[PDB]
């Protein structure tokens, strides 16, 4: 997580908002003219340093973890970034063509570093050199050193965004079925932008209304479709219903069609007020320009937000309406909030990203200040950034030391459990404190929600290593091989998909596609395809060949005629053996053979196959928590592969590498956990961390 946050997401977060200009042309017409006094400042490449800290009145030392640890330092390193007039002039008539550094790589602050990260001294040490530096070689683990105290951050699980969900609200309320969408931009302005559509009446007031910012009335969806640019009602019907043969949905839509029977033009529908403010600018009643700017810039911050993709919005909204309508028609059941796959695990990367974004916005706002102040001479470019560096470093230090998460905002929105102090009693405990999770639910707690274990938790989170009391079922612990998703750019994937034959939704038509399959990527609809099978196998083969980052996961919901692609960051996945159904030797067989494992043993005893070297040639494949709903698993490599102690289909695709690996760190110590009652195993898992012994060697 940290390595990703350092290599990228930092140059990105800067080059994204590296624009700031004060071109004081004349601040009023003329003044003849005057010159376009551009004050252009922009940030180029950034730089990072090794931990390099000077004391008072002295030279800078090359730090080392033990040095900071005993001297109560912060094992951080500094930063400095490059900073970048020639004009265009215009008196009034003509116009529309009327459009600095003072230093280089100016210091901007210092930020803490992850131990044994890419830029940590220890990440290259040899055991001899490692002892020369005097720290235990068993100290595998990325904690933090703040003011001389080992410091650890903990994962925060959250519901995944940009994904359709439906709920059945309680009977007394005039809403019976609701669908909600969350959104984000990673993570400008936080772009919460909740979208929700409510189904009214039981009463038989069957009508569908939607809530959109900044419109403060419930709006009939037909008006929304018309305002988007779809006038003829039949087209709107085509956007909701897909099997023209079926009718029921049309019957329940009938009242909704009746509601919008009065308006018949797109801008007239746009002319609806939905005021909510702000102060009415140029207006007659409501600018059509205002409405369209809303619907483009702010509406649905996912699939697109620029100017010109009304049709994509229409199709996605119709899809969501259809999903809502199914739940009211009982064709498909209620959504499951507590299913694990539709959650994510925010980690060090994203958290540091959030804090850095906030503090850098504060930075930029302060930069604008004292530049407008210097109406007279001159451009500083030097000294204000020193106080700015103090601010950035102080903010990072405070966040990582206090546990509050955010600036000094009087503990607003500051969930404290983010920067707990690392436990150091037993090596078992220490390891059992790194791979740790936490979610906010409440103070006291409910008793029908995720506290109890879930089926989806299989093989991802240890089913016994939990604390008890007021937090039971909240804190949970990753299983052994479970790994987290660091995300990847989807653009190459979508370009490849389009190249291999895609129907862009701009020219989709249900009539000519009575069986074609929808395609989703990170919860964005992009197109529809005829043959899903060949595309599925091709993507699978290309992944296995190693031409796509294996973290990517795809699912073909053949029952729902759907295809999903996921490449976000924060998913949880586990390894698995791949099983080829075909076999020249006969029935069925998992692809790996004895030669590969012999090579593995030879490589190990050499003191050149790696796990990666197993991955490339297609022998094991990562599986996220979402896919399992489309895979059959064989517990034993011989359970049914061919044709007293204890009690012991033919379409397997993957076999578990070993069952005993569903545990976590602490439970692994328990001998024969099968042969005793589960709560007793939980008692031991919790208790073992309270045992003495050794914790390091140094």
């Amino acid at each position: 997580s940290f390595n990703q946050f350092v290599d990228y997401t930092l140059q990105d977060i800067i080059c994204e908002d590296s624009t700031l200009i004060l071109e004081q042309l004349a601040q009023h017409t003329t003044e003849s003219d005057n010159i376009s006094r551009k004050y252009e400042i922009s940030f180029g490449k950034i730089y990072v340093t090794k931990p390099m800290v000077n004391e008072s009145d002295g030279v800078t030392h090359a730090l080392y973890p033990q040095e900071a640890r005993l001297r109560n330092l912060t094992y951080s390193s500094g930063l400095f970034v490059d900073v970048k007039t020639y004009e265009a002039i215009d008196v009034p008539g003509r116009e529309l063509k009327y459009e600095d550094s003072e230093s280089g790589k100016v210091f901007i602050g210092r930020l803490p570093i992850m131990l044994r990260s890419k830029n940590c001294y220890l990440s290259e040490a040899t055991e001899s050199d490692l002892y020369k530096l005097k720290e235990c070689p068993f100290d595998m683990g990325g904690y933090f050193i703040i003011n001389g105290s080992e410091k650890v951050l903990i994962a925060q699980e959250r519901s995944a965004g940009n994904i359709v969900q439906v709920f059945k609200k309680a009977a007394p309320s005039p809403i019976s079925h609701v669908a909600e969408i969350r959104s984000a931009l990673e993570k400008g302005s936080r772009f919460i932008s909740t979208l929700q559509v409510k189904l009214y009446g039981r009463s038989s007031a069957r009508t569908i209304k939607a809530t959109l910012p900044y419109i403060k009335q419930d709006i009939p969806i037909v008006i929304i479709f018309r305002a988007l640019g779809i006038i003829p009602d039949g087209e709107i019907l085509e956007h909701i219903c897909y099997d023209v043969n079926d009718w029921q949905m049309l019957e329940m839509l009938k009242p909704c069609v009746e509601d919008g029977f009065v308006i018949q033009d797109r801008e007239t529908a746009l002319d609806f007020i939905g005021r909510r403010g702000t102060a009415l600018g140029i207006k007659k009643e409501k600018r059509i320009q205002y409405a369209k700017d809303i619907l483009q810039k702010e509406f649905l911050p996912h699939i697109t937000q620029l100017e010109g993709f009304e049709s994509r919005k229409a199709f996605f909204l119709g899809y969501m309406i259809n999903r809502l309508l199914l739940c009211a028609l009982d064709r498909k059941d209620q959504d499951d909030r507590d299913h694990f796959g539709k959650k994510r695990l925010d980690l060090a990367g994203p958290l540091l990203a959030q804090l850095f974004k906030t503090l850098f916005k504060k930075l930029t706002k302060d930069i604008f200040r004292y530049m407008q102040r210097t109406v007279e001479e001159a451009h500083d470019f030097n000294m204000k950034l020193a106080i700015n560096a103090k601010t950035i470093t102080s903010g990072l230090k405070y966040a990582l030391a206090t546990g509050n998460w955010g600036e000094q905002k009087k503990a607003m929105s500051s969930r404290a459990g983010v920067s707990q102090v690392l436990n150091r009693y037993t090596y078992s405990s220490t390891l059992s404190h790194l791979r740790r999770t936490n979610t906010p639910i409440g103070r006291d707690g409910k008793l029908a929600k995720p506290r109890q274990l879930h089926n989806t938790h299989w093989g991802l989170v240890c089913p016994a290593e939990t604390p008890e009391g007021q937090a039971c079922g909240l804190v949970k612990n990753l299983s052994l091989m479970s790994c987290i998703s660091v995300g990847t750019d989807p653009m190459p994937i979508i370009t490849f998909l389009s190249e291999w034959g895609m129907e862009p939704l701009e020219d989709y038509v249900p009539h000519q596609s009575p069986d074609a399959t929808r395609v989703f990527v990170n919860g964005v609809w992009h197109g529809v395809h005829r043959n899903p099978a060949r595309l599925m196998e091709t993507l699978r083969t290309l992944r296995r060949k190693g031409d796509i980052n294996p973290e990517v996961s795809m699912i073909r919901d053949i029952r729902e005629k759907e295809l999903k692609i996921f490449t976000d960051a924060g998913r949880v996945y586990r390894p698995l053996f791949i099983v080829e159904d075909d076999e020249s030797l006969g029935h069925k067989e998992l692809k790996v053979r004895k030669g590969h494992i012999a090579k593995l043993m030879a490589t190990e005893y050499q003191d050149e196959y790696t796990w990666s070297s197993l991955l490339n040639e297609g022998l094991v494949e990562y599986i996220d928590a979402e896919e399992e709903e489309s895979i059959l698993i064989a517990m034993q490599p011989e359970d049914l592969e061919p044709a007293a102690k204890r009690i012991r289909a033919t379409t397997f695709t993957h076999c578990e590498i070993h069952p005993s690996m569903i545990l976590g760190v602490a439970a692994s110590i328990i001998p024969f956990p099968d042969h005793n009652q589960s709560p007793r195993n939980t008692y031991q898992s919790a208790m073992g961390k309270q045992a003495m012994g050794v914790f390091l060697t140094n």
């Binding site: 049309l250 069609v257 064709r331 489309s630 895979i631 289909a649």
Partner: protein
């Protein structure tokens, strides 16, 4: 129970009665187009039904692994291979009836042993 739309514009044709000729007419309440009524049927409700069980019967049903396979034969091709699954209508008052589709005959038939 199907709905017709105006040839001049895709809009729902509302039924309306001929006062003197006493036959139902469908007029496009948007534009002056009017249309004759095929059947005396106007609206259909079906409060309780047993339909929708054949939903999502794709030609690639047999492709997926996770649907279990049985040994019952289809009474068209008699091939013992087949794929079976229970009712698609997810309501508490459903039935334990199953549906057998056979890859060879590509046909769907009930599990009713009667």
């Amino acid at each position: 129970t199907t709905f017709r739309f105006c040839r001049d514009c895709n809009n729902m044709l509302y039924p309306r009665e001929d006062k003197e000729n006493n036959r139902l007419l469908f007029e496009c309440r948007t534009c002056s187009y009017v249309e004759e009524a095929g059947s005396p049927l106007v609206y259909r409700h079906e409060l309780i039904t047993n339909i929708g069980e054949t939903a999502g019967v794709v030609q690639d049903i047999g492709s997926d692994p996770t649907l279990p396979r049985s040994d019952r034969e289809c009474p068209k091709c008699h091939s013992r291979e087949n794929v079976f699954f229970q009712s698609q209508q997810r309501r508490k008052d459903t039935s334990m009836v199953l549906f057998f589709v056979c890859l060879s005959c590509s046909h769907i038939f009930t599990s009713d042993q009667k």
